[PDB]
Design a protein around this ligand. Structure first.
Ligand code: NA
Ligand code: NA
Lengths: 400, 455, 400, 455
């Protein structure tokens, strides 16, 4: 039931049914720190990275045809979800992500070797380092995967989620221009505005959130691949950085390019600190929008009672704004995640920032929580918001 | 493969092999927000809570023998680990934890009903709300679970890990009193201290971490159970609060009591915000300790090189033979996670409204994560780094003698003027202070090392 | 109009009317970073430190009688507020506080020299380093002053302020047990509780805040003095640490003692990070209390309207809960101050944490803002809170 | 020595030499909360605001010639710096900034009334609310001032300081291309890079800081003025908003416009929260740069020793001759202050209620402080550290040759096996790779240095 693998530290046992190699197993044994594995979309991004690197390596004459093709077939299968069991390493590993890099290197080599020899594992004929990792360091590969992942998640999770919110905020309030409600400043009675007008503030906040995302992504399109170990490009052929980036742009259909200065790309993660800053602003916007709805839906008899919130689950008969609670909790999570990203980003030393996994784990969590909670909020709260017109009219007609 | 269940809102389908009910399945369908489930030890805390509440209810005559005994047996199976598949709800739910409370209520009833009738699910003979949740709200139950879980995790994970680090810091540095290294202030050359003395700082930081936890636990021992919906204790018999706390104290063997003021326990989580603050401080201490070990072991040739860190894996694919301080990296990364987790807890804690703070799941999720991560990573750091740390004594000595600031250790022993002559001679010929001491016939190489000792 | 002073870097000009010396002026010229000077109470604490050190030095036989007496007279005058013009250095200086240490050393020497020779300044007969700073480093003196200051401010500003709040929360609500109001969970109508009961939550929060302060001060009583440059005590006579601490305990009438491990005292500021943690919890408590009052006083016609807040200043006739706004802003300040203290505390290197001035500036600001805002809040809001009983009764009698 | 004034609440005394009125003195007596006054540049912004609002009002025919001209002349004297004593109110006031708005309204009226009548104070001929505050609320005025001040400070303090740092990073490192130092990853010995290349990272961080500011300013150019109380623009004539923005654009020479949606501008300060986020990133960049320079200049003998930092003062009283990297300490301390200031702004920004975010003073206070501190400290760091940085070239070379990881730079030039023999020889005899290269007749001391160059 076991296979033996090795590296420069010696022999090590791996359970036969798993495709990973000596360094993954070594990491798996030595870092028994909680159960948070690397996010699926990061693994996906890392797989895309190896795919594109292999193609460039092949085109440069540096890989045998059968090895390049076997690596490519092997990676296509990972992208289809066939080896989700085979990336067991935790986030809390080496700060450069070396081990997760080797996790991808070894699994690809292993699948390819099973195709070519009939048996998985090992370094023949496909070597994890000399073929799958050819011309790469973890120091430039892991940041490249961090940026690919961030872009993919933002374009697939967050931007649609915000557009879903924008659309329903627009559609619901289109005809609330006839509803004249009483404004509150300091929570004290103020002068009148329409309910549509009040909701137009929220619409502006979300529109502006979408604009901030576009500006924050500009540096996240820029990829470190080609800097190798310390930023100089040692062991990377001239042109690799540019051709790799074009390859990733073509597969993702996103405008990726190479980072003009690779030293800045390795030594720091300022792009992601800035990006996390935009996530934080979005958290602030949503906290305000959700809090107002909580407040306007308070009651039914001893609150404000201007809005009726959909009732989705069960002091019997009492129904709570549960979606607002889920969303406002996520907002507080994102704000704390941002402080972690800040502090980790500030702790770079010379040629390398070695806080990379904690940074990307927090970025990707914030994107996913914001997207999922907003979509839930729209479906189970915003879509069925109705104003209580008689209540709004009574409140207005009492104002001094 | 499906069973039908019902609540106030109507009919709903549950996959047959699972034990939860209608309200849990409803929540499962309505809060599809990522993948972060309630932590194992919080579910455990909540089960313990229900076991004790059912026994007190039974003592008050408010549960029949058949029902109280089956509830108790069902809960023991959950505490045995037999139903870890049956708590699927995410953290990002209602802010009171109602759905997770009800998840526990339904699963207990369901296990009991299978035992009594042969078929799982439903509300007869055992009813989730009327029996399992009798005399309880989620408003007082969930805060009770939060504190039980915090105490359990702190005592089972955190205190043992810090003591593990303490013991090995003490053991490893016992005989480092004769290793005389150079002090660095502002990262600039300073005067000497023993390697042991430098480690004594770290030891003190961990001893103080342990004291801080004991003070931080004081209010976490106090339980909300009995406040019910708003804190008034309506639908709760006089004495239930005290008798429930006693039971939990017996089962856990921890000094749990009831909170004097139930309103404070529902409306806020200041106790967990204070506790998070202590976790924050521990993160700050560990960051300093781990950073020093990394800095002291930097090299092997182009850095400081005073400590040899155990080499556990290959550090690089391009540069073979390179070994990195990977355990320090995992620990310092965790430290940054705890610092951020603390801000989340702070902000959530500050957003209470009137009778209830409804940010409860996110608060307890961060507290428990911070505890697990500090504990797991400290344990790993000890096993794979502290255990095998060795000083590079020859390198430590070389560096000590390079310091020009040794002059001020020489002043009281050799005289102010004479030390000045040595330091002048060392600048002119470009030699060490030791070599200049021997050159001018003031002090041998052995007499020089004795004066330099801290004393 | 100028006097010339010097140090090992050479000669430097000081305006004649000022008492400080070469190193203070040098710092004053080289760190032109905003206008935040060291807090008054820190300077005060540093002056107390030099007073007690001199007395111990004198008792050990290490100072001439006339110098010890002149130093003591000189310091008594600083404590009386006579040289508030003479500590111009900014917080954003060397991270060990050396320059502010020399600021105190030089000014004391200067005043003493004016007494003894008729002219201020210089190092004769009282030398800033060899007499006023005898047996001291900035590395152990500045942490000692940080802890003295924190204790003094907490005992003189914060503890009385919280007791003032506790007392008035108690007195105002004593007879609110007859007022039956409707409870709100999730801001939805709930079951009843008395107004006194609701206020008893707030009373508990403040009581518990007072208990947390006592626990957090335990390590802040422990003083670094005697560790000198790197923690070893080089150039400090045996017994100095203990006798100094007793001297400070006697002058302040507070239970100060020496730090058992001086290395921990220099290398880190974990005591203050923990203390700042308690300030943060207090900020959280007060934010809740103040927010509820904002909410319960909302109206007069379109809010909850359960409480009447005092009207202290001027949509004419509209009066806002201005004291609650001041207080809740301070709370957000304290929470951010706490993150600065955290991050700075985490950045220690080997024998010394060199973020000391930013840490103490934030600690002392949080104490002063919390105290002043709470006292203001009590005087201009809590003292005159009255319930609107008819409104409370109407709301209750509408509950489902 | 006193003058009497009045408002809705009654009679109140003001010291005679000051120009403020009844509402300012009331606020002065009721908010005795520490000492933190409104920043100079925010007061200036608010004056500019009133100058432009009065001119637009006059153009609409809603101020008489006498009154508009005297208002304009009074404001110019405030912008000249003639009344810096007359704005005593603390930051910790009402959350809308009403009292500071009224401080400006009263002082302008008072200066104008002295000019027109000979006696300062009061509300005739110039009335604080009816003339100086005409068509304005504090709800739209204070946010307008916040953005004007942020733009002014960013353009006058921050952008110049970052450009100053940029210019000197470029100038100092121009000819450091021939200095070949060793790279460190995980603080472990790695492969070489030029000193210039290492500095190129820092240069990139600052160039990107400047781009980030330009994007962050986009929404700060947009002004609330015209929304009045709740955002509807009641008591504001159509066109006032556009014409006010134009005037401010003319006076400042900055591209200010009116905010399309006034409700968003009153109810929140997301734009300043986003801007704070950019300041945060700049703090993170500077922390890395300053920390590296400190680490590279550590020593002078027992650390890294690659850079010589200019020595500006004595570092110690016990250890004479010790010099500390004091400018790096002041800058990194400021960085921690900005990071905390950002959390305050984030939390304050998140506590808006309906039509108004009433945490405005604390938000703008932190933003402006962060800008001033980053600017002042970067400027000082350049003058007193970056300007005079020199590499210690002999030390840089020594360290480079100690690296065992040079082997991988030798592989493509000398062959894999041959480099292995050199590294084996270097381990056996305990020498450098260069000495072992010459020993085995593979490579001279000059040919070795050429292969090592990054290329
Ligand atoms: Na987090
Ligand atoms: Na601050």
């Amino acid at each position: 039931n076991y296979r033996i693998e090795s590296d420069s530290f010696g022999e090590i046992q791996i359970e036969e049914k798993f495709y990973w190699g000596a360094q993954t197993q070594r990491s798996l044994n030595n870092f028994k720190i909680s159960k948070q594995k690397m996010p699926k979309i990061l693994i996906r991004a890392l797989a895309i990275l190896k795919k594109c690197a292999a193609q460039v390596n092949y085109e440069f004459g540096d890989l045998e045809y059968k090895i390049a093709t076997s690596i490519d077939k092997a990676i296509d299968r990972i992208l289809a979800g066939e080896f989700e069991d085979n990336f067991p390493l935790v986030v809390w590993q080496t700060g450069s992500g070396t081990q997760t890099n080797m996790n991808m290197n070894e699994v690809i080599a292993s699948i390819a070797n099973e195709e070519l020899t009939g048996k998985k594992g090992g370094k023949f004929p496909v070597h994890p380092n000399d073929h799958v990792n050819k011309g790469q360091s973890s120091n430039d590969s892991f940041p490249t995967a961090m940026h690919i992942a961030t872009v993919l998640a933002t374009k697939q999770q967050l931007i649609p989620a915000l557009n879903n919110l924008l659309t329903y905020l627009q559609d619901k309030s289109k005809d609330w221009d006839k509803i004249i409600k009483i404004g509150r400043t300091h929570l004290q009675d103020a002068t009148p505005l329409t309910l549509k007008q009040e909701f137009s503030g929220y619409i502006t906040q979300i529109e502006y959130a979408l604009e901030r995302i576009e500006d924050a992504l500009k540096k996240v399109y820029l990829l470190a691949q080609g800097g190798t170990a310390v930023g100089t490009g040692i062991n990377s052929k001239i042109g690799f950085d540019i051709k790799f980036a074009q390859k990733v742009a073509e597969f993702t259909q996103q405008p990726f390019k190479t980072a003009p200065n690779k030293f800045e790309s390795l030594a720091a993660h300022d792009a992601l600190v800035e990006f996390s800053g935009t996530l934080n602003t979005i958290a602030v916007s949503l906290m305000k929008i959700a809090n107002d709805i909580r407040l306007l839906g308070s009651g039914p008899r001893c609150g404000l009672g201007e809005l009726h919130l959909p009732e989705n689950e069960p002091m019997p008969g009492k129904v709570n704004p549960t979606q607002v609670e889920a969303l406002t909790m996520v907002c507080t999570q994102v704000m704390g995640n941002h402080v972690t990203v800040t502090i980790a980003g500030s702790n770079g030393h010379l040629e390398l920032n070695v806080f990379k996994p904690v940074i990307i784990y927090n970025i990707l969590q914030s994107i996913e929580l914001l997207s999922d909670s907003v979509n839930s909020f729209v479906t189970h709260c915003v879509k069925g918001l109705e104003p209580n017109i008689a209540r709004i009219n009574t409140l207005r007609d009492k104002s001094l």
